[PDB]
Amino acid sequence: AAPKNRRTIEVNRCRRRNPQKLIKVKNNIDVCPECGHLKQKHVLCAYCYEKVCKETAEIRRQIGKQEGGPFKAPTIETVVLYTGETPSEQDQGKRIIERDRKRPSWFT
Amino acid sequence: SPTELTEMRNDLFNKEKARQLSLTPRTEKIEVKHVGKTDPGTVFVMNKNISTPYSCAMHLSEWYCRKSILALVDGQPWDMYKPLTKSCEIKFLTFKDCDPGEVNKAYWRSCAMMMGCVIERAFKDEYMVNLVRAPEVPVISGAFCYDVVLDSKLDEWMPTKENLRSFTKDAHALIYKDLPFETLEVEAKVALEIFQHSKYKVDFIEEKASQNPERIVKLHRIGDFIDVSEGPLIPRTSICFQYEVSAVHNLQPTQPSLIRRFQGVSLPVHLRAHFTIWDKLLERSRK
Amino acid sequence: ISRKWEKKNKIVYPPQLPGEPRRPAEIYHCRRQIKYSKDKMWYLAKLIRGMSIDQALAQLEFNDKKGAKIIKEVLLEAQDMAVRDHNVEFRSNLYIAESTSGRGQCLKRIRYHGRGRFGIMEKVYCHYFVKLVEGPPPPPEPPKTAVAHAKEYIQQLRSRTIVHTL
Amino acid sequence: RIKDYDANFKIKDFPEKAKDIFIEAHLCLNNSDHDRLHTLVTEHCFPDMTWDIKYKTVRWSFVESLEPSHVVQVRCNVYGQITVRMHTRQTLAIYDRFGRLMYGQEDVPKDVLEYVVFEKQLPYGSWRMHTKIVPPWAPPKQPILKTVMIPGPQLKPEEEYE
Amino acid sequence: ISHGRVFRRMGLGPESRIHLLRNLLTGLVRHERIEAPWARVDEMRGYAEKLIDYGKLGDTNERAMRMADFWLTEKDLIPKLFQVLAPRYKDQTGGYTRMLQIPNRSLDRAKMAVIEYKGNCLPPLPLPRRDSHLTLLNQLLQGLRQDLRQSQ
Ligand SMILES: [Mg+2]
Ligand SMILES: [Mg+2]
Numbered sequence A: 001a002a003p004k005n006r007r008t009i010e011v012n013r014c015r016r017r018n019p020q021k022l023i024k025v026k027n028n029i030d031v032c033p034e035c036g037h038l039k040q041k042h043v044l045c046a047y048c049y050e051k052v053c054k055e056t057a058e059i060r061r062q063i064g065k066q067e068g069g070p071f072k073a074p075t076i077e078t079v080v081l082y083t084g085e086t087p088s089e090q091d092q093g094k095r096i097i098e099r100d101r102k103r104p105s106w107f108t
Numbered sequence B: 001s002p003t004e005l006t007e008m009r010n011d012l013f014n015k016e017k018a019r020q021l022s023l024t025p026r027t028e029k030i031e032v033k034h035v036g037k038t039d040p041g042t043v044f045v046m047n048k049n050i051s052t053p054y055s056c057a058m059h060l061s062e063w064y065c066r067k068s069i070l071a072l073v074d075g076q077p078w079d080m081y082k083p084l085t086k087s088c089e090i091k092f093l094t095f096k097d098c099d100p101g102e103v104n105k106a107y108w109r110s111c112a113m114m115m116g117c118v119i120e121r122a123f124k125d126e127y128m129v130n131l132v133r134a135p136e137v138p139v140i141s142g143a144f145c146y147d148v149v150l151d152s153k154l155d156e157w158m159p160t161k162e163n164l165r166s167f168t169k170d171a172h173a174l175i176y177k178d179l180p181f182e183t184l185e186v187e188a189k190v191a192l193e194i195f196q197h198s199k200y201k202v203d204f205i206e207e208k209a210s211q212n213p214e215r216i217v218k219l220h221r222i223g224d225f226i227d228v229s230e231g232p233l234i235p236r237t238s239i240c241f242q243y244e245v246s247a248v249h250n251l252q253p254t255q256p257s258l259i260r261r262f263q264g265v266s267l268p269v270h271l272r273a274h275f276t277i278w279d280k281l282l283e284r285s286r287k
Numbered sequence C: 001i002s003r004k005w006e007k008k009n010k011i012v013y014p015p016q017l018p019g020e021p022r023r024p025a026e027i028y029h030c031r032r033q034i035k036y037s038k039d040k041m042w043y044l045a046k047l048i049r050g051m052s053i054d055q056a057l058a059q060l061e062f063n064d065k066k067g068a069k070i071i072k073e074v075l076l077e078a079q080d081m082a083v084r085d086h087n088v089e090f091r092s093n094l095y096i097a098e099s100t101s102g103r104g105q106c107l108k109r110i111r112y113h114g115r116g117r118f119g120i121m122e123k124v125y126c127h128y129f130v131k132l133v134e135g136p137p138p139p140p141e142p143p144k145t146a147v148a149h150a151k152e153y154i155q156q157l158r159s160r161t162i163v164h165t166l
Numbered sequence D: 001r002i003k004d005y006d007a008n009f010k011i012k013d014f015p016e017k018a019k020d021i022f023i024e025a026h027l028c029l030n031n032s033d034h035d036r037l038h039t040l041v042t043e044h045c046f047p048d049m050t051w052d053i054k055y056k057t058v059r060w061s062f063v064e065s066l067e068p069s070h071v072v073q074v075r076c077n078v079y080g081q082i083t084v085r086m087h088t089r090q091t092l093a094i095y096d097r098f099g100r101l102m103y104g105q106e107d108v109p110k111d112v113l114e115y116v117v118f119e120k121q122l123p124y125g126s127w128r129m130h131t132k133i134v135p136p137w138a139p140p141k142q143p144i145l146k147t148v149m150i151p152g153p154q155l156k157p158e159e160e161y162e
Numbered sequence E: 001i002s003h004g005r006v007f008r009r010m011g012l013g014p015e016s017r018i019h020l021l022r023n024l025l026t027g028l029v030r031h032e033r034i035e036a037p038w039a040r041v042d043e044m045r046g047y048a049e050k051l052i053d054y055g056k057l058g059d060t061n062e063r064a065m066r067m068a069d070f071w072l073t074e075k076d077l078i079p080k081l082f083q084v085l086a087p088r089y090k091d092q093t094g095g096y097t098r099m100l101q102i103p104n105r106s107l108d109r110a111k112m113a114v115i116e117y118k119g120n121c122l123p124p125l126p127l128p129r130r131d132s133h134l135t136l137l138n139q140l141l142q143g144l145r146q147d148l149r150q151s152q
């Protein structure tokens, strides 16, 4: 099947500017109370999630260095301790991941 | 006449505005640094006695303007439209902060002020209405209260449900009007000049001038409505979304005069409540 | 090619008289030769037409189309140059008066088909244009009420004349 | 050295000529007369004067000179620089592309003390403004009309505010 | 018609679906926090909970050991499953996993989610928090609650 006639620009505009095809305005956007960058109510803040992701990547690099090779997952819990922090009595008996930076305020 | 009283009060208010703005000619630059958690370090070089925390928010972004209800300048609460007077530290306060207490109080006072305006402009001309005070009742009380003394002719008249609905309609008309909450710190002398025809307002101005070191009093206008404010108010009436003049209660000590307390309840656009929750809140505010 | 949009930023108006309304600032910005279809760009442009700069940026930040990022970059550049060069006092006090996409210079390639036949691909490029006007966004045109619509009908009735006579 | 190069120069007569050059150059700025600016000011001056004023209108006008202009310091393929101290009174009114006032008043005169360093090149060279020395003790300039926002550190996610 | 069908059709078939979920769940056991397409994370959340239950069952349980051997492709994690995660959740009865939507993937704009075992050593996620009790609405509702309690 092939077009019997060329579709006019008027018809084409009627089709491609219909409200369905138009991009809908999103009303679920809000300001993240922590950093102030925009976020969607149901989605995590991109900026804060990036912070957490980069800190997690650093901690995981430290974990990999401590483990030293594949198939070396510890059988004991892990605790991340930053500069100026000493293992607590509760943290005793857990492998310590030492980060060469001060404790982040958001991380507790 | 009430129209003449309002016109002359607004005239005095405008003359005070002109005098205050003329007292600081040219453009003196004051540095205001953002001490807020978000956008830290931003320093705004503002015009002294002209720029406002709303101008700060406009520099920052539209979200600041839309969500910020109050401003902390050097740790004290400030109206978003109160001109800044010196280099300082600014932090915008929203409804959804960890401790919105100050914003809650400001919204409460603003709602009381709107209630007072509605009360004064509702009754028919033949009946005298004199607004005595807006008690600073806590939010936990479930209703902002505004006290008025009506004409002795209506000493036995209580508002009907239709009358209360008319008051609510007037308040919603104000909300739709979306008037800013203009503010001025003006001397007790000028405040008395404005309110010479109201013993209650005169004595309240005296109390405020006694509390503060100087004789400086907070005088607020929504539109053509001058009133003495206990504290900072919210930017504009459009902040209010749900507003209901819940009830009116005569106070027990009626022998000096009938002090009728108009109790209402409101909620801003930012903290809208569902229909059922709003109905329960109205029931609790009617007490 | 034409580059009038860039030149539109170099027009200097005569100084305004003291008793004249303050002329809103107008900033024209554009990005040329975007590897994107102008038809797809037009939807984003139309979406952001008539909105404040902050609202447009917020809408674009959460749009999955590739053109959204490019338009956001263009809008940010327009805001920056409006503040730095066009004497716009507040960043947020800007609204998108005009936003359109135009055809760019496109390259022709060959698409091979099944039986030694072929088609002519077009590596589509599009331009993007924005005009930022200082001041709050103009209020949306209110829907015409029954009162106004009946008033228009009655005006049409009154406009009637006795046609084809003295 | 100046006199052995030119043979008709007068330090005593210089200040009036320097003032005339200054006034003419600023009127050329007012009227956007770049051709005459290239004759009345040096190539180290023309950019400084015109770069930031491009696309905006400047209404400059010299009203009077409080104290008479007088030479101060002179030092010398060979150029000769003369520093002239001028404490005069002028006016400014700078508008935007849109004709909106953004600096100064069209009528109010202001007193300005400045040190204009002129220069000359020694066959067809002439005396042209080279620089304007601003005293470290110079009074702060007139404040701007529009408020300004100074962004703080645009911290990346891994970074934290200090 | 897919009335009542509770399993998504993923991968190249049923076996491929199981293998994809198995890889995602092995990664989750190893790292305690995995970001992946939203639907796949939603599908694998139940299997993660079931692994935690099987770990609770104990090492000596042959059925639990077989399940762990199947699901944990890297066998160094089976000791972890039986000696770290299960002891961690011994007190809990369920809800061992936190799943939250993440901004869409930059490459294909796919719906993405992060799933993490609760109590992990990793930095906390920017979890959404409800409005403070000190807000205007919450204070009004607290007043309602106090009034009702005083009534009763
Ligand atoms: Mg084609
Ligand atoms: Mg598939």
Ligand SMILES: [Zn+2]
Residues within 6 Å of the ligand: A032, A033, A034, A035, A036, A037, A045, A046, A047, A048, A049
């Ligand atoms: Zn954030």
